[PDB]
Design a protein around this ligand. Sequence first.
Ligand SMILES: COCC(CCO[C@H]1CC[C@@]2(C)C(=CC[C@H]3[C@@H]4C[C@@H]5O[C@]6(CC[C@@H](C)CO6)[C@@H](C)[C@@H]5[C@@]4(C)CC[C@@H]32)C1)COC
Ligand SMILES: COCC(CCO[C@H]1CC[C@@]2(C)C(=CC[C@H]3[C@@H]4C[C@@H]5O[C@]6(CC[C@@H](C)CO6)[C@@H](C)[C@@H]5[C@@]4(C)CC[C@@H]32)C1)COC
Ligand SMILES: COCC(CCO[C@H]1CC[C@@]2(C)C(=CC[C@H]3[C@@H]4C[C@@H]5O[C@]6(CC[C@@H](C)CO6)[C@@H](C)[C@@H]5[C@@]4(C)CC[C@@H]32)C1)COC
Ligand SMILES: CC(C)CCC[C@@H](C)[C@H]1CC[C@H]2[C@@H]3CC=C4C[C@@H](O)CC[C@]4(C)[C@H]3CC[C@]12C
Ligand SMILES: CC(C)CCC[C@@H](C)[C@H]1CC[C@H]2[C@@H]3CC=C4C[C@@H](O)CC[C@]4(C)[C@H]3CC[C@]12C
Ligand SMILES: CC(C)CCC[C@@H](C)[C@H]1CC[C@H]2[C@@H]3CC=C4C[C@@H](O)CC[C@]4(C)[C@H]3CC[C@]12C
Lengths: 402, 402, 402
Amino acid sequence: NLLLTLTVFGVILGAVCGGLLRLASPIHPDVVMLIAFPGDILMRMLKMLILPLIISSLITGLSGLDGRLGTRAMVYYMSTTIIAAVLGVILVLAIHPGNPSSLDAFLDLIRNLFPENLVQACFQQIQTVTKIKKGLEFKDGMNVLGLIGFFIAFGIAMGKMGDQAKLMVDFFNILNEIVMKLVIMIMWYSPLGIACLICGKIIAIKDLEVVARQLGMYMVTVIIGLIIHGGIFLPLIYFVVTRKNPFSFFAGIFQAWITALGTASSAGTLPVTFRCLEENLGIDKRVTRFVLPVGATINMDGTALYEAVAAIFIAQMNGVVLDGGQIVTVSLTATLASVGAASIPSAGLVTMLLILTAVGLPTEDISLLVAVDWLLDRMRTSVNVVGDSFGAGIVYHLSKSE
Amino acid sequence: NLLLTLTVFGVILGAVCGGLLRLASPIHPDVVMLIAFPGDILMRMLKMLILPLIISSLITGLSGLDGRLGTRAMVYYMSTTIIAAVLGVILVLAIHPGNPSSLDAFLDLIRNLFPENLVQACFQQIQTVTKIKKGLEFKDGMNVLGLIGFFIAFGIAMGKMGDQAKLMVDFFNILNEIVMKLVIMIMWYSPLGIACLICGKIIAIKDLEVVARQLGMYMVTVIIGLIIHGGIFLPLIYFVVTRKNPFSFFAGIFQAWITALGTASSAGTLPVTFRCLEENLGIDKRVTRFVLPVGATINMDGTALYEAVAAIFIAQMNGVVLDGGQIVTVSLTATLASVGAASIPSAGLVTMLLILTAVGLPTEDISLLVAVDWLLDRMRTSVNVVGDSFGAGIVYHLSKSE
Amino acid sequence: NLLLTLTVFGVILGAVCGGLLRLASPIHPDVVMLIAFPGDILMRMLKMLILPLIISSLITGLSGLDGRLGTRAMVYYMSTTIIAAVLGVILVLAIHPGNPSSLDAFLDLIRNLFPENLVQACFQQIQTVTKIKKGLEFKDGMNVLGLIGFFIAFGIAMGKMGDQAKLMVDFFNILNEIVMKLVIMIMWYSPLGIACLICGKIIAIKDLEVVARQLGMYMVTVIIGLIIHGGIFLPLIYFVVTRKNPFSFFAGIFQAWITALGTASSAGTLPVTFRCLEENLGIDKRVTRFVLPVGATINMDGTALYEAVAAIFIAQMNGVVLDGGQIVTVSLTATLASVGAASIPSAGLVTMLLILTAVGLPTEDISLLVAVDWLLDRMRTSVNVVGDSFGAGIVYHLSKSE
Ligand SMILES: COCC(CCO[C@H]1CC[C@@]2(C)C(=CC[C@H]3[C@@H]4C[C@@H]5O[C@]6(CC[C@@H](C)CO6)[C@@H](C)[C@@H]5[C@@]4(C)CC[C@@H]32)C1)COC
Ligand SMILES: COCC(CCO[C@H]1CC[C@@]2(C)C(=CC[C@H]3[C@@H]4C[C@@H]5O[C@]6(CC[C@@H](C)CO6)[C@@H](C)[C@@H]5[C@@]4(C)CC[C@@H]32)C1)COC
Ligand SMILES: COCC(CCO[C@H]1CC[C@@]2(C)C(=CC[C@H]3[C@@H]4C[C@@H]5O[C@]6(CC[C@@H](C)CO6)[C@@H](C)[C@@H]5[C@@]4(C)CC[C@@H]32)C1)COC
Ligand SMILES: CC(C)CCC[C@@H](C)[C@H]1CC[C@H]2[C@@H]3CC=C4C[C@@H](O)CC[C@]4(C)[C@H]3CC[C@]12C
Ligand SMILES: CC(C)CCC[C@@H](C)[C@H]1CC[C@H]2[C@@H]3CC=C4C[C@@H](O)CC[C@]4(C)[C@H]3CC[C@]12C
Ligand SMILES: CC(C)CCC[C@@H](C)[C@H]1CC[C@H]2[C@@H]3CC=C4C[C@@H](O)CC[C@]4(C)[C@H]3CC[C@]12C
């Protein structure tokens, strides 16, 4: 992919330039600002497509693209993704890769899920404050959960309406097309932006060793989680429901997992994994003809885990402890973000700002995660492919009523 | 109505549970919070449909559903409703059921009617402040009058456009359908919410007697106003315009008023009141074929009076004196709220938050009003039916040009 | 034009009433407030159509109404308008008609061009603050550049889509029609509003001589700029590109410039200037059949210059020095405002609030500018007509590939 290769070239460049300036001399604060600036603009542009993207995606999907076995597949996907995101959260909290009022927080979480006002939720959200007299107060920051929730309601309502809602459906389809064009164009400007951010981040970092160590630890944490979710959770769930050998199930797909790593894209891995389940496992083409394609765009357990660990890592590196609700916000958004990062084209950096915007984090340290995304990409892709295959086996096993 | 009966069952339950907990022991503040919480969410959900509801209703109505006699009917309706709402206001201020800078307030009222910005008006509104240097400042709280006003302008503008605006009209029709589905679904969750609110309200109340006394006084105040508007104002206006016996006019409709109480629904009272004016009064089927049906969804004088007295009662119980503008805001919103509470299905609790949101009141004490709405419902229904009948007589009398 | 004559009659009236009250006695502050009040409402109404107008105009234009020679015409127009607006800015700063952190300001300018959030930008915008620790902070005031920019992106994206975006295009066309009806209706209420504002402004002014002197100086400044742009810049550019006699080019059009002054409307001047270039200069009817009509609604160099000098004059009279970014905001909005004041019907007062809202100025002193707009209108009209003629010559000269 020209842009993936372009983004990595930009990273290297950005990195080399930052290193050169640092070893050359201590850069003036105003000049570091001007150095990282074209990265600020990359974020500002992407972050300004989040809201329209959330609204069009939710309403275009839940209406436009809505049997029993289909229900089974969706249940497996959502369940596995929530599992993956929760694993991510536990590991990033335990491992703590990033190195720097209980009921009330969850109470606010639940309030922010029903924003008193749609508009205001687009930029701010409710918080509890202690005065020992508690109050609600606004705090800046878009209510991602507030809006996602209400638009889910709205989309499910329209969807039920039927051809009566045709017009509004078509309008929102057009909107989604326009916003996706803009995301594509911005991600084309991304390589420069990422280069500038990395060059700036290096010039600011006080001890390369510490930051290098933290980022490496984050990568291992993402790695560990991909292994546990795919190597243990997926296979165990297979057995618990199928009572069959997960290794026997996995033995056949070896070619499929290989294509997964090889193509680094479920889309390109898709025809091989058709073959591997139809021929080797002998899964009914029906189940194979639905679970595989649907999963290729929504079942992204590896993506969700990466997105949760990354969000708490950025939190941690910024000396910010997330409250119980903020952690639930990460888990909820991480799952949605992965079903998006999978559907929306070149939306890898959009979704990560969505999760960070949702927890109210800096959103600048997103640059470090990019510097290493290219290594973690292979694994996370393969994890997503594996899950879809297990799902097809599970759906087929749970579909013997026939 | 399963839901009306459900809501009353919920009230009783809520009440019994609150009473039990109170007589059992003093509940911890955090636990009372968790008790009333599912009521907080009922409000948060309803209040989040106000804005879309205001926009779709105004634009779908003033465009989609827009002779001389028709003009006459609308004039009578709007006039009588404003009269009913003003009577409500005077009585609630005089009686004062709830028991706890002149020009500037009306000046702000007039400003808030033309919000400098549509978006900002969706969550905040202009106020005057004294520094002896006066200034305008924002104060949180959706500009209900700001938005209603501008959308009235917008809808009247589209309406005139004609079939040219077809598309935009159809789009907003679909929106209105979706938002009404959501209001219906939430009001289904209402019974639990109302029960929780009442249980909490009882646990907090310090002296049951005082609150019981206040709520009873509010009910009598609503009652008195229904009597004065229907028993005096309506009949007097009939004579002043018709110069005929209002008792002679009322004598025939007795059956109609009975059905009104019996069906507790103008809709179910509708065929009887057709009969009562066509047969007994001998009103021309033409006038009867328009005034009755149009009124059955817009002429709600009893509803407007209830909605104004309730709004100032909630104000009063909360030790808040309304300024001259806030009182005008209640009168204006109360009239619109009654034409809505009449059109929008199961919108009894939505409209009351609209009036409270408009005056910027607590919006939680709405629970007490629900506890007694079921008693006042009968009377207010009959008052609305009576007004429509008088209107048909007045329109027919004012339509002898023919 | 009944309304132009009405607006001037209102000015005279307003002025006479203000003068009478002032010579009669010192008016009470509350009564001056009530005097100017119906002007406040004129602004509040107009300013509340800016946002919808910006959105519908940008999306209806850049999509609905989008060869080489056509590209040439647009380049000439945009270039000449930016030149005109910059001349305006320099002159108003130099002459200083109105009589009362470098990089950071431009950095904010560039940020406000990519608002992190669409909604929030509709009412507020980013600023740098010094604590010696710099921060970004919100400051009230709609991000005109933020929204214009993003909608330009959105419209260009839809435009490319093609007939696929038909629906959304038609929807926004309808919206634009509705908003334009409202602007027309408000400008009908303008005469009273302007009269009230002028009556109030006179009653407040402490020294008529000083204010009279300042306004006269502003008029000369607008005059000087119209002369320099039309008398020097336009003709020079003609020669630089054509290497032909600008006087020989101008000699023929004399009749065209006359109609310009005579009709005080490029629209009415349009058939004469067709004649003057086709017959006298002998410009190919093709170029004449495009450059003239397109320019008659977008090439408004005289309008842009007026709008920049006016914006900085209102700034200056209000003892407000504009930062480097605010000046660029004026130049950018002034150009857009002139292409609008030209397209949108009776949008002379809307566009001036847009420029003032963009720089965050009082927006009330707009009354003085109206008091003298009628004199400056003749000249600015003729300047716009002249530019279109020069453009036709330049486009024809640059189009001899043929
Ligand atoms: C036979 O197969 C049938 C199948 C049916 C598909 O149904 C759709 C239902 C909604 C769903 C799951 C779909 C696609 C995009 C999904 C969205 C991506 C967006 O991303 C987010 C997060 C990140 C933001 C940047 C944007 O918004 C979410 C809120 C948004 C999202 C998760 C909302 C839900 C959407 C699929 C067809 O599948 C193609
Ligand atoms: C022959 O008969 C012809 C007749 C013509 C009807 O014309 C329509 C004109 C607008 C009007 C009066 C109508 C219905 C809903 C009315 C709305 C209910 C909403 O409620 C509110 C307040 C409460 C909020 C929760 C929502 O918004 C208002 C702002 C909204 C409202 C009052 C705006 C005005 C609307 C009727 C047909 O009648 C069916
Ligand atoms: C053969 O001829 C072809 C030609 C093609 C025309 O293409 C269109 C492209 C967009 C353009 C330049 C056009 C008309 C209105 C223009 C708008 C007026 C508005 O005014 C503003 C400022 C003032 C505000 C009050 C409203 O918004 C701008 C943001 C808005 C504006 C400048 C955005 C750009 C628009 C012409 C046809 O021409 C008729
Ligand atoms: C100010 C910017 C444009 C300077 C250049 C920065 C680099 C990193 C970026 C920014 C915009 C990018 C281009 C924008 C879009 C395209 C079209 C696509 O089909 C191939 C890649 C190509 C041609 C990109 C190559 C790299 C690019 C030039
Ligand atoms: C958490 C909630 C759901 C617990 C139950 C609370 C009670 C008061 C409410 C909430 C939702 C309600 C249900 C939602 C919708 C319907 C469908 C309708 O056609 C009949 C009533 C029925 C079946 C309602 C009965 C009462 C109900 C169960
Ligand atoms: C409160 C207002 C209405 C008082 C009058 C103020 C004056 C200055 C204004 C306000 C509204 C204006 C009218 C509104 C619209 C029209 C219709 C148009 O085809 C001719 C002019 C005419 C008839 C205007 C004449 C002047 C007018 C009466």
